[PDB]
Amino acid sequence: VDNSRTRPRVGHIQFLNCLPLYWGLARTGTLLDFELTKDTPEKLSEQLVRGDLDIGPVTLVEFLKNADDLVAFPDIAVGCDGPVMSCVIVSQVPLDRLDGARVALGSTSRTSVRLAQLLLSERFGVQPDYYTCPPDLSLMMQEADAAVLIGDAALRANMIDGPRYGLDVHDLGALWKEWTGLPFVFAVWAARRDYAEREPVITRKVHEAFLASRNLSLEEVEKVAEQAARWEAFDEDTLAKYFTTLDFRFGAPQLEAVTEFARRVGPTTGFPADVKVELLKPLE
Amino acid sequence: SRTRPRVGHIQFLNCLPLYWGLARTGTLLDFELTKDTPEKLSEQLVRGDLDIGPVTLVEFLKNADDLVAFPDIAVGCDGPVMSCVIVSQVPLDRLDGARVALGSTSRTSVRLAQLLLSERFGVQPDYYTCPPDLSLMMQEADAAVLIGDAALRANMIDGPRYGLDVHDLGALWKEWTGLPFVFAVWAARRDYAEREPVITRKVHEAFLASRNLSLEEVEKVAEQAARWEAFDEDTLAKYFTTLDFRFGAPQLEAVTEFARRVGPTTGFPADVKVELLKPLE
Ligand SMILES: C=C(Oc1cccc(C(=O)O)c1)C(=O)O
Ligand SMILES: C=C(Oc1cccc(C(=O)O)c1)C(=O)O
């Protein structure tokens, strides 16, 4: 029987927002310490919660609903301070005309759709008729007055489709910034609590390798954008702007934003407004 | 917009150094990579789920009109290969009429094993395909043909522990013919190679560059990989340096002779043509 130690099963968001991180993981050789699974953020959250992964990215709302069973990694997250570029409301009408209107919510999103609902309800005071559908701007704009998108589809709407067809595109990071002055965290990295307690060292090594890979990806953002531009509808300048607009930090100012958002949506989402975010402790 | 080529990659240790090279060079970010066992990756490439990938030799020969092989990279050996074995509780000349389990992930080594047992040792066993599991196989058969990590484990660990004979298929072929052996090649679908000659060529050159780097850094790869395997650093470095990743004239010589000896009993012409990706003139 092969009872040797097993590589941690690690999720990775397939979208462009984590493409520089993937570059870092590859260049550092970290990938060879992982059994990597790539997918969309809602699938990766399901897999980690149900035990198909040991460590991975968790969209914030799903992390908070499972906070007792997950341990978040400090100093890395998928966030913004102001615009995030890839979490948007695309609308054919001004936001204040959306009361009773149809608003399509992309099915891959858990956090941005809730942030959009919070903003529309509690900031602009409109109550639209929401519905979930697969992310497809063309179909959404044929059947609804507005749509909430994330990931590459949202970046495409923001940078290409929106300007082409004269559609308003509202940046959810900027809308939240205007409303609260705060940055925003859309997704965190976490280990399952049982995996973190069974393998504290591997969990720590995975965490440190993520930080190192993230740091390298920041230094080489131009090389990453140059390479990725050959395979995307976005050009090199757009991708480098995107990669540098994203904020991958996760310290005290970012936790402050998570705390406030969790408070405003917890009771109507599925977790306490004062839900406890447990962070992976460093070696003392 | 242009789409990344869909590229297969054998999940076994034999291509872990190559994966290291693909990551370190950044080549991985030009691929949409799929990892699986060699028989699955071969099926996927033939049926169009991949554009470029490793193809176990026998399956390449059965589909040679529709595949274009990459020169100067392959999975082979010159003598022992370490991870393609016959594990037997009896000497090979005592296997006539006995049950021999063929690991289901193999297409080439199982045929090479059959060729050796019939035409070199002159025994005709009762073959059957089953999942690779040395323990279950040794309870249900007198011998078993294994590849990949399972074969490497049998050769380096399980065999010596339980006193089981383990025959290296590369060495048996070398003894019989004096030739090296090629177990798998890399190929592009012909339709993909003709639609995207530049991408196909860049993928090929990136594979060569990554392979070369993996040879240069074999020790770091072994040190890292040993932390996740039952094999230690010295065993992995020995394995990685015993594998022969070349694919030039002497290796094609071996493919030609093997194809000749098994074609009529496998499912392709004995003189099947191996088309190679041509470099830019
Ligand atoms: C930066 C983004 O923000 C995210 C990331 C992951 C999940 C979600 C979600 O809404 O569930 C949002 C992006 O999508 O690019
Ligand atoms: C070096 C090996 O040889 C192979 C590689 C790929 C496929 C096959 C097969 O038999 O189909 C054999 C190994 O398995 O490690």
Side-chain angles (χ1 to χ4, degrees):
Chain A
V1 175
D2 186 8
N3 283 116
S4 70
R5 312 188 70 187
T6 308
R7 285 174 186 83
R9 297 167 301 167
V10 180
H12 189 88
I13 291 166
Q14 67 187 41
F15 293 151
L16 288 166
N17 53 37
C18 289
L19 184 51
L21 181 58
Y22 183 64
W23 165 278
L25 295 165
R27 295 280 272 93
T28 58
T30 294
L31 283 185
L32 277 76
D33 295 314
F34 295 178
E35 186 63 25
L36 194 80
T37 295
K38 285 191 177 183
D39 212 334
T40 53
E42 93 280 24
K43 302 301 187 184
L44 295 173
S45 303
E46 295 171 357
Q47 294 173 30
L48 188 72
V49 167
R50 72 170 174 250
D52 291 336
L53 298 167
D54 304 311
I55 298 168
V58 193
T59 179
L60 182 60
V61 157
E62 293 297 311
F63 175 89
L64 297 171
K65 297 154 93 181
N66 293 275
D68 298 319
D69 306 316
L70 302 170
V71 180
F73 285 1
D75 293 317
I76 183 176
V78 183
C80 66
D81 191 349
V84 71
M85 294 183 68
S86 54
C87 302
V88 301
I89 304 176
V90 185
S91 187
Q92 296 176 250
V93 302
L95 297 184
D96 55 49
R97 302 222 204 94
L98 286 174
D99 189 68
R102 270 179 261 93
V103 172
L105 309 174
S107 63
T108 63
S109 172
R110 296 296 182 268
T111 298
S112 293
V113 287
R114 184 63 187 98
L115 173 61
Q117 290 171 314
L118 177 65
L119 285 162
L120 289 169
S121 282
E122 292 302 292
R123 178 173 180 204
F124 299 99
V126 295
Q127 297 173 333
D129 286 322
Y130 292 108
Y131 71 96
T132 302
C133 70
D136 185 319
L137 183 62
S138 290
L139 291 163
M140 290 158 123
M141 291 295 93
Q142 291 178 335
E143 293 308 317
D145 301 294
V148 176
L149 292 169
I150 65 165
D152 300 359
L155 185 66
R156 188 187 159 78
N158 194 3
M159 302 293 103
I160 297 160
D161 307 325
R164 179 169 297 154
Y165 298 108
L167 294 172
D168 290 336
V169 183
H170 299 271
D171 189 302
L172 284 175
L175 287 180
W176 167 263
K177 186 73 187 290
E178 294 161 1
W179 193 32
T180 70
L182 297 173
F184 199 85
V185 174
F186 290 95
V188 301
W189 273 261
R192 288 178 54 87
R193 174 164 290 285
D194 58 7
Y195 188 83
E197 295 183 4
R198 188 170 85 251
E199 302 281 2
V201 177
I202 298 180
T203 301
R204 190 163 338 282
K205 294 310 188 189
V206 171
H207 172 226
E208 292 169 356
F210 265 103
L211 299 181
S213 293
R214 189 273 313 281
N215 293 343
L216 181 63
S217 68
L218 300 186
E219 294 171 2
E220 294 184 337
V221 62
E222 185 255 9
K223 294 179 180 66
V224 180
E226 170 181 327
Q227 181 184 36
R230 305 183 185 111
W231 308 109
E232 313 288 344
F234 316 99
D235 64 358
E236 176 177 345
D237 289 329
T238 297
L239 293 177
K241 182 187 180 188
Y242 178 55
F243 296 156
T244 52
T245 300
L246 294 165
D247 196 332
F248 296 99
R249 294 172 293 171
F250 194 51
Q254 292 76 31
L255 267 158
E256 184 178 355
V258 170
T259 303
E260 183 53 29
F261 176 70
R263 191 193 66 82
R264 299 192 187 197
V265 307
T268 59
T269 305
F271 56 94
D274 59 347
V275 59
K276 174 63 154 289
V277 179
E278 218 69 65
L279 293 173
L280 186 59
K281 302 317 188 192
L283 209 69
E284 181 176 0
Chain B
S1 70
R2 206 89 152 275
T3 309
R4 285 176 184 84
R6 298 167 301 167
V7 180
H9 188 86
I10 292 166
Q11 67 187 40
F12 295 150
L13 288 166
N14 53 38
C15 289
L16 185 52
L18 181 58
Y19 182 64
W20 164 277
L22 295 165
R24 294 281 271 93
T25 57
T27 294
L28 282 185
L29 276 75
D30 294 313
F31 296 175
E32 187 170 80
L33 194 80
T34 296
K35 285 190 178 183
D36 212 334
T37 52
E39 93 281 23
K40 301 301 188 184
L41 295 174
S42 179
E43 295 171 357
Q44 295 175 31
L45 189 71
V46 168
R47 72 170 173 250
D49 291 337
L50 298 168
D51 303 311
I52 298 168
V55 192
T56 181
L57 182 60
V58 158
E59 294 299 312
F60 177 91
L61 297 171
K62 297 155 94 180
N63 292 275
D65 296 318
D66 306 317
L67 303 170
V68 180
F70 285 0
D72 294 317
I73 184 176
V75 182
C77 65
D78 192 351
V81 72
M82 295 184 67
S83 54
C84 302
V85 301
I86 305 175
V87 185
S88 187
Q89 298 176 250
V90 303
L92 299 185
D93 56 48
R94 294 155 177 91
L95 285 174
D96 190 67
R99 271 183 93 80
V100 171
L102 308 173
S104 62
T105 63
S106 170
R107 297 297 183 268
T108 298
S109 292
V110 288
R111 185 63 38 179
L112 172 61
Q114 289 169 313
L115 176 65
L116 286 161
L117 290 171
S118 282
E119 289 302 293
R120 180 173 181 205
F121 301 100
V123 295
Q124 181 65 52
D126 287 322
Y127 294 109
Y128 71 97
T129 303
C130 73
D133 186 321
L134 181 61
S135 290
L136 190 53
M137 289 159 123
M138 292 294 92
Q139 292 180 335
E140 295 175 350
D142 300 294
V145 176
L146 292 170
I147 65 165
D149 301 359
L152 186 66
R153 189 188 160 78
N155 193 3
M156 302 293 103
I157 296 159
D158 306 326
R161 180 168 298 157
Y162 297 86
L164 294 173
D165 290 335
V166 183
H167 299 269
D168 189 301
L169 285 174
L172 287 180
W173 168 263
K174 185 73 188 290
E175 293 161 1
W176 195 32
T177 71
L179 298 173
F181 199 84
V182 173
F183 291 95
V185 302
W186 274 261
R189 289 178 55 87
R190 173 162 288 285
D191 59 8
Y192 188 83
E194 295 183 4
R195 188 170 85 252
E196 302 279 1
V198 175
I199 297 180
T200 302
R201 193 158 45 240
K202 292 185 177 175
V203 172
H204 171 226
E205 292 169 356
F207 266 106
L208 299 182
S210 293
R211 188 273 314 280
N212 293 343
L213 183 64
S214 69
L215 300 187
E216 293 169 0
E217 294 185 337
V218 61
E219 296 165 352
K220 293 179 60 177
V221 180
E223 170 182 328
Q224 182 186 36
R227 304 183 184 111
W228 306 109
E229 311 288 343
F231 315 98
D232 64 359
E233 175 177 345
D234 290 329
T235 297
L236 293 178
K238 180 188 179 188
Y239 178 56
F240 296 155
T241 52
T242 300
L243 295 164
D244 196 332
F245 297 101
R246 294 173 294 171
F247 194 50
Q251 293 76 31
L252 266 158
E253 253 189 68
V255 169
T256 304
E257 184 52 28
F258 175 70
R260 192 194 68 83
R261 299 192 187 198
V262 306
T265 57
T266 304
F268 56 86
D271 59 348
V272 59
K273 171 61 158 176
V274 178
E275 218 69 66
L276 294 173
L277 186 59
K278 301 316 189 191
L280 208 68
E281 180 178 0

